[PDB]
Structures are given as structure tokens and as C-alpha cells.
Structure 1
Amino acid sequence: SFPEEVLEHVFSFIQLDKDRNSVSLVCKSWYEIERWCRRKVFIGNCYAVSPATVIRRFPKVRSVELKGKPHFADFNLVPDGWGGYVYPWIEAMSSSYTWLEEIRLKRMVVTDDCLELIAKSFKNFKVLVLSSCEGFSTDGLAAIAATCRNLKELDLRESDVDDVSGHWLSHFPDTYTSLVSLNISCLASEVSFSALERLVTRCPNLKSLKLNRAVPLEKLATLLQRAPQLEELGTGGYTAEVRPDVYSGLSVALSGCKELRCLSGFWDAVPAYLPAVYSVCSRLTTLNLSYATVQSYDLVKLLCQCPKLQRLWVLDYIEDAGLEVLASTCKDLRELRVFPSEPFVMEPNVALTEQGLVSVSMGCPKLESVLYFCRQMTNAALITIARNRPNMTRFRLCIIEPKAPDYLTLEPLDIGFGAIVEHCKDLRRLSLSGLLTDKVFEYIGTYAKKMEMLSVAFAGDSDLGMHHVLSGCDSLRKLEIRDCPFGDKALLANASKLETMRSLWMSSCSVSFGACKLLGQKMPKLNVEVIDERGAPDSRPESCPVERVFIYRTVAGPRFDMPGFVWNMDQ
């Protein structure tokens, strides 16, 4: 109800994607003012929309975030070459968003050409996050280091980089001082240590430093003395000859970092050097001990010192006894992830069971996010967890043996997971495992009204199970399924449901090529992609199950970069 100047100013105070979208739809006038002052754009599926559409709607963007391959790519189920190329995005933006500051990519293919184009088009470029990306080398890293004079973040989390050489880092010039966050943890190639040390020294705003394994433990203290303002540290290698002078240099350097809240790295960690980390312990909010294969009592010694801990990622070496300690000591714990050591061994190498998760659920009243890998489970334990933690928002349970029943009753785990979705009303994410019938899905459809993301493997009896989910799950945005006896019937019965979701993934299920064709006919605003490496789906009977089908809504239509093993079903 105000001059255009005032509304624009009102909007500066609205930065959430959803609120921005609501304002754009109050009237044509607000639509117009908001397009023009929108700073950030989040594109959760890069094939849901074209670069040209984004660039013309939102001409003044300074921050973009893009995601490519679906999650099951992490499990090696999307073959190489499938797609997720960011180049076209960067080419379109290169001439349009001259002022762009941030690019955050997740599971995209990013090449050295991409990186060079970024470096050269965006003078004010400050933030590059490459999360689980692939396609580039240290040469492309070299171009960013040499050219991006304003760079504040270079974050490479879990990317596959072509490790040509560690020389790229020494391309940051001596005039460069603006670095705030560096995560080189995925790099195998050794960086020039003195180049690194000189970079840390000349960068006073550096707050997060996550090293690669090739920085040895004995060099860590030297870097820390140069960056006492650090809030996050990921160590390099954590192994050395056990020596007083080495241990004490490390101890002093770390206790000189008074702002440190987050610790990670710990590769090859030797128990003798873990204590250097103790002065920091009392203020730590995140600990990632995932690469540390030290044993339960050693983890317990550390964790006793960590009353403020909010996030723990640990190996199952923690064991139930360790988790019982965690539950006592860490009352502010929000997130627990427990990863398998030895997942390709069926008999337990560690004493980590349901009881560890039970203890934590009882003792940690703010615990709301779980990823837990174990070998056995009971419906009784799941029911206790759900009752204790009605506040759970993300619950991810992976029992190592597919289709393992309750180990005491031999019943499916339908009832235990039923209890989770029944008692945890704000549960937004679930993944399942153990023996499960169609009944679990019926519980899910009935109770999981807030669930946004569901991952399923080796579960269910028939299409009625998938039908319950599509029919009942009001907030569903992502459904990913492998190896379940789910076919044509639920998929076609619930076709318009699919236009309310980001995507549906099914691999090794029983969805026929005929069903895929039909769904593509019926739903032209869907890209229905058959991903199958046996050759043309035409060369087999229509009734034959496809290897994989990936389905997603889009306003851009069929994509232009499908490889030879991918077919779109649109007419």
C-alpha cells in the first residue's frame, strides 16, 4: 500500500524462499517489486526449470543454489553420464548476473571449464560450495585461486576431484587475504605446506579450516598458531610418533583457539594424541569422529569433556556402553549419526545394538535427528524411542542385513516404525529397514502427515504399500525406493500426486516399460526417465521391468542432455 521504494525496503527484511513466493502472488505489483529485489534463488532440481526462465524472472540475483542428481546417486545407483551438468547454468549466468557472489552446487557435474568461466565472469565472486560434485580437477581449482580476488569460501565437501597436483593452492596471490572458510578435506593431493601456512597467516577473517589427510599431525600446531580465531577445524592426518614435545605443542596451540566450536578429521587417529583436544572440549558443539577408528573407552574419555555437544558423528566403535555415557553427559545433543565400521561383515565386530539408540532417546531430551547403522532391532526398542522422543524430526535406521526381523520375536518391524510415525508428529524424514510388510506403509500413510522425505529398500509386499504412501502422505516431496515389489498399479493410480512432489525414484522394482510410457502420455508436465543400460526398452516386451525410473515435475519440459541409456517418455 506504499510507494515502490518502501515496498522494496519492506522486502529486504524477507529472505525466506517461501515468504518471497507468497509476496510475489499478492498482486501483479508485488510480483514485479519482488522479482527485482530477490537476492537468492534455490533450485532443488536443476531440470525442474531452465536457466533462461530463472534469469529473466529474477534479474538481480547474487546467490544461486543448484542440486542435480538424486540422493540414490550416493549409493551408486545413477550411472555415470546421467546428467547434472552445471555448465549451461554458468554460461547463461555469465552474461546476465555480472554481480553474482555465491554458487552452491550439490551433486552436479562441474568441469574445469565451468570453474574458469566462473573465475572470469564474476568479479565479486565470494562463495563456492561444491558438495558431492565431480568432473573437475585441481587445475580448475588453480583458476579460482589465481583469479577470484574477493573469494571468501572455497568449500569442497565430499567431491570427487581429479587430483592432478597440490600446486593449485599456491596460485592464491600474496595480495589475497579475504578467505573465511576453506574445506579441502576431499583432496588426496598434498598442498604446498608453506603456501598453506602463508595463506592462513595473511587471512585474519579465516574462521573454518578443514584440511586434507596429507597435512600431517606434527604440522597442525604451526597452522593453529597462525589462526587463533578459528571456529571450526578439520585436522589433517592424526598420527605421529608418540612424543611429549609433539603432544604439548598441539595442546597449547588448540587451547590458544578460544573460539573453536567444531572439530573433525582425525584420520588414522592415535589414542595417545586425542587428549590435546581436551581444552577445546568444553565449548565444542560439533564433533565428527567418523574417520577415527579408536575404540569405545577412548571415545568415552573425550565425550565426557563435551557438555555443550549438539552434534555427534561417530563410528559404531562407540558401542552401547559409550552411548550410555553420551546420554548422561550430553543433555544438549540434537543430532547423532553412528556409522558402521566393517559394514561388509554380517557378524558384529562391535557391541552396538538397539540399546545404544534407546539410551540416547531416554537421556537426551533435545535429540531430534538420528542416523543409526546397527545389525539388530526390535519393535520394543522402536516403540520406546518413539514414546521418549515425540520431538524427532529425522529418523534414519539402517539394519545391515536386508529384511532382518525383530530379533526377539521374529516379527516384521511394522509396529515399531508405526509407533515412530504415530508419536513423532513433526517427523519430516524417514528411512526404513528390516523386515517390513505393506502394513508399515499403511501406518506411514495414516500418520506421517509431515513427512517430506522417505527412503525405502527391500520392503513391502505389493503395490498397496506404495499406494498407502502416495495416497496418505500429505507433505511428501521426495520418495526413493529400491528393491521393493512395487510396480505399475500404485504409480498410475496416484499419477497426479507426482505433480506435488519434487521427485520419485524407483530402481530394481517391478515398474514395467509399458507403465512408464503410459504415465509419460498421461502426465506431460512430468519428465518420466527410464534409465536402463541394457539398450532400447523397445527391444524387450513392454511388460518387462525397467532397471530404474526417475520421475520429476518440471516447467522446462524434456531435458536436452540425456545420454544414450536414458529415455524420456513424453509424447
Structure 2
Amino acid sequence: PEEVLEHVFSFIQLDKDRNSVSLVCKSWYEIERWCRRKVFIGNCYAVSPATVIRRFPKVRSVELKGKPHFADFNLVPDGWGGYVYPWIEAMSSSYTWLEEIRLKRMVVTDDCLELIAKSFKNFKVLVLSSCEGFSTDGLAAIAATCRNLKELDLRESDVDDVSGHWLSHFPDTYTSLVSLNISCLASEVSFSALERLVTRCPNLKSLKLNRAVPLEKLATLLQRAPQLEELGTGGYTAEVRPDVYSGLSVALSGCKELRCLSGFWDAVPAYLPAVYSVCSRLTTLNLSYATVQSYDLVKLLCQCPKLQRLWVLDYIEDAGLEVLASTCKDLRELRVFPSEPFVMEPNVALTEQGLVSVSMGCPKLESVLYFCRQMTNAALITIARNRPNMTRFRLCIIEPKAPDYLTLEPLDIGFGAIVEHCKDLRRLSLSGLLTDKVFEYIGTYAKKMEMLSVAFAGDSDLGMHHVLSGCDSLRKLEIRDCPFGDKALLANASKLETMRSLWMSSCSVSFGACKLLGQKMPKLNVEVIDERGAPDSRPESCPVERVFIYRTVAGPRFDMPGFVWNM
């Protein structure tokens, strides 16, 4: 074959498969780099713009992630890195046809946004997921210039709030909006501009609003957008009035294609039942910001038989979840957030009986994130016995080093059962009183695990050592405040090359061991992020504040700030 291959290859879109075909023959390597539409870059520092731009020169879509995950826990101080500019500037003159840029935890600035705008004529998709460092001015520029923008998705970013003016720069000739997620903006956009905008966008399919858009106005935008597949409300409070409740209700039943609901800030129980015609076609629901008691959630959930995803505060409760269990036979992912964590005081009656219920009740539960204050190995044993198909399990017990509250034992057989019975468990996040014994379970059993997160657990480096030793599929390992150090870390030095990153903060990894590892391992960047001043100003054997290791073909980076050392 030949130009046939071009056509055969267009059918292949997974990175794994693309990489696979690139390695099958020199000819394939070549046809492939030429006709590859998207690149996934999980770690911006693992390779460089020019290397990417020069393999893969016909790229239409680019995805990039910066800071490690524990940057959400405030464990990576400001300035660390993540600058996206070099990428924009590199692609800025190579990537003429560029359509999408999805960035996760990056630094992004107004001149980045300008440059994106000025250089990509066909530009369509911008998702900035937990980025920072731009302002509504940057948004202005994108609005004013990108004439084919289809998605402007700002999930979870710190924007500089200069002002809502930015939304009016979309010209009147602009119609192509497909997705707009401005939930993180505090700045109040102009309601006229916005409404006028929703109306001339016939393809608008997902609209997610900021708080500043009061519940009273919801109805009006919805009558303008009756094709919405997903909606995130704005403020969801008001004087209780039936003109108001009624306009809402009608507006909502107007959207026969809604599947996704969220927002619900300051929600007034009185005004939830409007959402009910919607309820029964509904796949995702997110009630995270709704601080609304159990019975209210339960009235809402009762009529969502089709529900596949639910994020909810913990205000739902055990009784809550016993309901969900009989109700949503199709639930796939459940996330219970905590309602007030810095109080040690059960303010709700959410225990482990919840999770246990859900898991007998929903044959398709495969993803869980759950904050309770108490737990037992009897629960985890049951949970694991009931959901062999579990693929993501994060548990997060609010008291740390809290043990099974009936036996006082720590939770090792607990999580042992999970790792032993969910042979696809691909992500696992731990807590409770835990000894090196759990890691032995993990390393013996967790063979597909890819991501593991650990805090206040383990006894000695033996723990970390069964993990790098045992876990074949490990990609991300991240750890804080455990008694883990030099030994496991150098004993398993080359595992680090089969892994995307290892992050360790407040552990006991000495500066001496960091140093050695950099030299044993030219190709890892081993980074000591420590804020007390140079590490060599302290004895080699003092634990660094944080060290973050990761493979790279780019070697060491150029934008370290002052409190980061490469080795």
C-alpha cells in the first residue's frame, strides 16, 4: 500500500496506537509523523517545543499539563514553573493550522492569549483547566479575535478579575460558540451581551455560568438556548415567588436535550424542584456547591433513574445513599465531598455505611471519591467483595492515621481487599492508620494500578520499596508526610524511568540521596524544591522539603526559579 496508509492511519487516534504504528518500519514512522492531528503532552518538561514541532509538523491539536497534581494542595509554591509561553511562541509560527489547545495546570498570560489569537486563524478550542496568571483582558483578546472559536472552557482557573467587559468583545458576526464554561469568573459579565450572545449561537451546547448570573435570569437565557445538552446554573437563590419558580420550570422543560446539570450556588431548597422534568433523562449531576440537606437531595435523586455520575456534598448522608443505591442502577462514578472538614465533629451522618450501600446497590459503580470521618476493614472488605469492577478508588478519612473504629486495627487488610479484588484498580488513593503491610498488599496485588497517592501512611522504606518494586503499571506516585527516604528510592532507581513522575514532600529523603540519584540518572530531572535557601548550606543528610523526580528527553529545564535545584 502507500497513500492508502495515510487513509488507514486516520482511523487510529489513540496515542498508544499511533506510537505503536510509528515503530513498525521506518516508512510508517514517516507517514505517521506527517498525518498526526493531535499530540498529548502529560508533562510539559519531558520534551521540548522544538522537538515536538519537528517530529509531528502538521499538528492541529495540542494538549499539555504543567505542575504535578499536589499543586492543588498548595504543596508547589509560586513560580515553580509551568510557563506555557515557550510553547505558544514555538507553535506560533510552525502550527499555522492549529485548532485546539487544552492546558492543565499551567501558567498562562495575556500575551500568551494575544499570541494565540493573533497567530491561529482557524483557532477553535481553548480549555484552561486550573491555570493561572491571565486576566479578563486576555479573555477580551480571544473574544475580539478568534473568529471561529467553538469552546471557551475555563474550568477552575484563577483569573485576574479586571472586569466583565471581556465578554462583549465577541463581535455580532460571531455565531459559532458551542461551549462556554465561565464558572470560575467572579467578575460579572454583562447580562445583555451574554443574552444576545446565547441567542445568535445556534450550536451552543454546554453553557456554564458564574455565580453572578442571578437565578431570576436563568429562565431568560434558557428560553434563548433550548438545545442545551448541559447547563451550569449561576446563583440559585431568590425570594420564593411563583412567577419566578414557574418561569424556571417552563424554561427547563423547554430544554429536552439537557443531560447535565451543575452550579446551584447558595441553592434554596424551594427552587430545586423546577429541575424535575429534566431529572429523568439526566446523566451527570453536580450538587457540590449546594448546601442542601439530606431529604432535599433525596427528593431530587429519586427521579433520576438514568444518573451515571453524581458529585454531592455529604449532607446527602447514609440514608441519602441507601436511596441512590436502590434508585440509580446505572451510577458509574460517585464523589462525596466533605461539608466542613476543619471541624472534627460529625456535622452530618455520613459514615461508611454509605459507601457500603452504594456498592451493593450499583452494579456499575467503578469510580469513587469519598470523604468520611470513620471506616473499618469490614466496610472495605465488603466494598471490594461487591465491586470487583472498581477502577478508581480514592478514600479520604478525615482524622489522619484514624484506624478501623471497631477493631482499632489499622486499615491494611482493608485496602488489601480492594487491591486484591479489583484487578483493574487503575488509581488508588489511601488514608487511615496504615503500616508497611498495606504496601506489601499493594505491591503484590495492584498490578494495573497507575496512580497512587499516599499521605501519613507506612512504617519505613520497606513500604515505598514494595511499591516501586511490585507495581508494574505505576506512572504517578506521590507521597507526603510518610517515613520514606533514601533507601527505597535509590534501591529502585531505574523504576523511576518507567514512570512519569514521583513527588515526595515532607518525607525523609536527604539532600545527599537527591544528589546521588541525579548522577546515577542523567535522564531523570530530580528537583529539590525547598525554600530555606541552598541545600548545600545544610548537612547532606537533612531531608529536603520536597523533591520531584521525572523522566525527560529534554534534560534539565531553563526556567527554574531560585528555590528549585536540579540534582
Query: How far apart, in 2, do the equivalents of 1:81 and 1:353 lie?
Result: 40
1:312 shift after superposition: 0.1
Q: How does 1:544-555 map to 2 (within 5 A)?
A: 544-555=542-553
Query: How far apart, in 2, do the equivalents of 1:250 and 1:334 lie?
Result: 29
Deviations 1:139-186 (A, max 9, x none): 000000000000000000000000100010000000000000000000
Question: Which runs of 4 or more aligned residues in structure 1 lie more than 4 Å from their structure 2 counterparts after TM superposition?
Answer: none
Aligned to 1:91: 89
Deviations 1:371-421 (A, max 9, x none): 000000000000000000000000000001110000001000000100000
Deviations 1:127-150 (A, max 9, x none): 000000000000000000000000
Query: How far apart, in 2, do the equivalents of 1:69 and 1:4 lie?
Result: 41
Q: TM-score, normalised by structure 2?
A: 1.00
Instruction: Classify the secondary structure of the residue corresponding to 2:383.
Output: helix
1:540 shift after superposition: 0.2
1:126 shift after superposition: 0.2
Instruction: Classify the secondary structure of the residue corresponding to 1:161.
Output: strand
Q: Please, which of 2, 5, 10 is the counterpart of residue 3 of structure 2?
A: 5
Aligned to 1:34: 32
Query: How far apart, in 2, do the equivalents of 1:512 and 1:208 lie?
Result: 49
Query: How far apart, in 2, do the equivalents of 1:509 and 1:15 lie?
Result: 40
Query: How far apart, in 1, do the equivalents of 2:112 and 2:309 lie?
Result: 34
Aligned to 1:349: 347
Query: How far apart, in 2, do the equivalents of 1:147 and 1:469 lie?
Result: 50
Query: How far apart, in 2, do the equivalents of 1:221 and 1:180 lie?
Result: 19
Query: How far apart, in 1, do the equivalents of 2:446 and 2:101 lie?
Result: 34
Q: How many residues are paired up?
A: 567
Aligned to 1:531: 529
1:536 shift after superposition: 0.1
Query: How far apart, in 1, do the equivalents of 2:339 and 2:142 lie?
Result: 36
Query: How far apart, in 2, do the equivalents of 1:373 and 1:210 lie?
Result: 26
Identical-pair percentage: 100
Q: How does 1:356-505 map to 2 (within 5 A)?
A: 356-505=354-503
Aligned to 1:288: 286
Deviations 1:300-346 (A, max 9, x none): 00000100000000000001000000000000000000000001110
Instruction: Classify the secondary structure of the residue corresponding to 2:310.
Output: strand
1:40 shift after superposition: 0.2
Query: How far apart, in 2, do the equivalents of 1:536 and 1:69 lie?
Result: 22
Aligned to 1:265: 263
Query: How far apart, in 2, do the equivalents of 1:347 and 1:303 lie?
Result: 27
Aligned to 1:330: 328
1:524 shift after superposition: 0.5
Query: How far apart, in 2, do the equivalents of 1:412 and 1:347 lie?
Result: 21
Q: TM-score, normalised by structure 1?
A: 0.99
Query: How far apart, in 1, do the equivalents of 2:392 and 2:539 lie?
Result: 41
Query: How far apart, in 1, do the equivalents of 2:342 and 2:286 lie?
Result: 22
Instruction: Classify the secondary structure of the residue corresponding to 1:182.
Output: strand
Instruction: Classify the secondary structure of the residue corresponding to 2:116.
Output: helix
Deviations 1:468-514 (A, max 9, x none): 00000000000000000000000000000000000000000000000
Instruction: Classify the secondary structure of the residue corresponding to 1:533.
Output: coil
Query: How far apart, in 1, do the equivalents of 2:469 and 2:55 lie?
Result: 34
1:436 shift after superposition: 0.2
1:259 shift after superposition: 0.1
Aligned to 1:230: 228
1:52 shift after superposition: 0.1
1:247 shift after superposition: 0.1
Aligned to 1:180: 178
Query: How far apart, in 2, do the equivalents of 1:191 and 1:134 lie?
Result: 19
Query: How far apart, in 2, do the equivalents of 1:223 and 1:441 lie?
Result: 52
Query: How far apart, in 2, do the equivalents of 1:442 and 1:528 lie?
Result: 26
List runs of 5+ in structure 1 lacking aligned partners: none
Query: How far apart, in 2, do the equivalents of 1:454 and 1:565 lie?
Result: 27
Deviations 1:243-271 (A, max 9, x none): 00000000000000000000000000000
Query: How far apart, in 2, do the equivalents of 1:295 and 1:274 lie?
Result: 12
Instruction: Classify the secondary structure of the residue corresponding to 1:340.
Output: coil
Query: How far apart, in 1, do the equivalents of 2:157 and 2:92 lie?
Result: 23
Q: Please, which of 311, 314, 325 is the counterpart of residue 313 of structure 1?
A: 311
Instruction: Classify the secondary structure of the residue corresponding to 1:352.
Output: coil
Query: How far apart, in 2, do the equivalents of 1:559 and 1:402 lie?
Result: 36
Query: How far apart, in 2, do the equivalents of 1:168 and 1:259 lie?
Result: 29
1:4 shift after superposition: 2.4
Instruction: Classify the secondary structure of the residue corresponding to 1:47.
Output: helix
Pair 1:509-2:504 in alignment = no
1:347 shift after superposition: 1.3
Query: How far apart, in 2, do the equivalents of 1:415 and 1:213 lie?
Result: 44
Query: How far apart, in 1, do the equivalents of 2:482 and 2:211 lie?
Result: 39
Query: How far apart, in 2, do the equivalents of 1:432 and 1:18 lie?
Result: 29
Query: How far apart, in 1, do the equivalents of 2:89 and 2:400 lie?
Result: 45
Deviations 1:84-107 (A, max 9, x none): 000000000000001100000000
Q: How does 1:147-166 map to 2 (within 5 A)?
A: 147-166=145-164
